Amino acid sequence: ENSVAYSNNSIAIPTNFTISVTTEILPVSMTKTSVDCTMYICGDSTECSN
Amino acid sequence: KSFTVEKGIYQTSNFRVQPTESIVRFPNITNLCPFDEVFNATRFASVYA
Ligand SMILES: *[C@@H]1O[C@H](CO)[C@@H](O[C@@H]2O[C@H](CO)[C@@H](O)[C@H](O)[C@H]2NC(C)=O)[C@H](O)[C@H]1NC(C)=O
Ligand SMILES: *[C@@H]1O[C@H](CO)[C@@H](O)[C@H](O)[C@H]1NC(C)=O
Ligand SMILES: *[C@@H]1O[C@H](CO)[C@@H](O)[C@H](O)[C@H]1NC(C)=O
Predict the structure, then answer these.
(1) In chain B, N or C: fewer CB atoms in 10 Å?
(2) Does B14 touch chain A (CB under 8 A)?
(3) Is the CB of residue B13 less than 8 Å away from at least one CB of chain A?
(4) What are the backbone angles phi and psi of residue A21, rounded to the nearest 5°?
(5) Ligand 1: distance of its center to the CA of B34 in Å?
């Protein structure tokens, strides 16, 4: 808790400065993939293939 | 499923070699036994027997 003062005719002014650095990270893409239905759904049975 | 192909790259299929021979491997004994004789038993026992 840090309450700021208030008055009719009072202001505040800085007299010095400094420089800082900051980092940010963003995803851009995912890993592609591919599938062939026949191999996965049916191993070798010819009747299954028909 | 058409006659005309536009330029680009396509994936048709995956090549698969097909089988040629059939192989069976079993243990090695060639003797008969009383299977039929157990079936053809003169007297048949009970469940408790
Ligand atoms: C403003 O602040 C900077 C620091 O952020 C002050 O510079 C430092 O001053 C002290 C006091 O002599 C030195 O020990 C430090 O080495 C100074 N910093 C650097 C990076 O050298 C600066 O003095 C302040 N402004 C005024 C007018 O005093
Ligand atoms: C500020 O001004 C108002 C009128 O504008 C007055 O009532 C008040 O007493 C003054 N002082 C403070 C501290 O608010
Ligand atoms: C079956 O074949 C194996 C390997 O040749 C041999 O070790 C074994 O004696 C054979 N059994 C019979 C009953 O011939």
Answers:
(1) N
(2) yes
(3) yes
(4) -130, 155
(5) 108
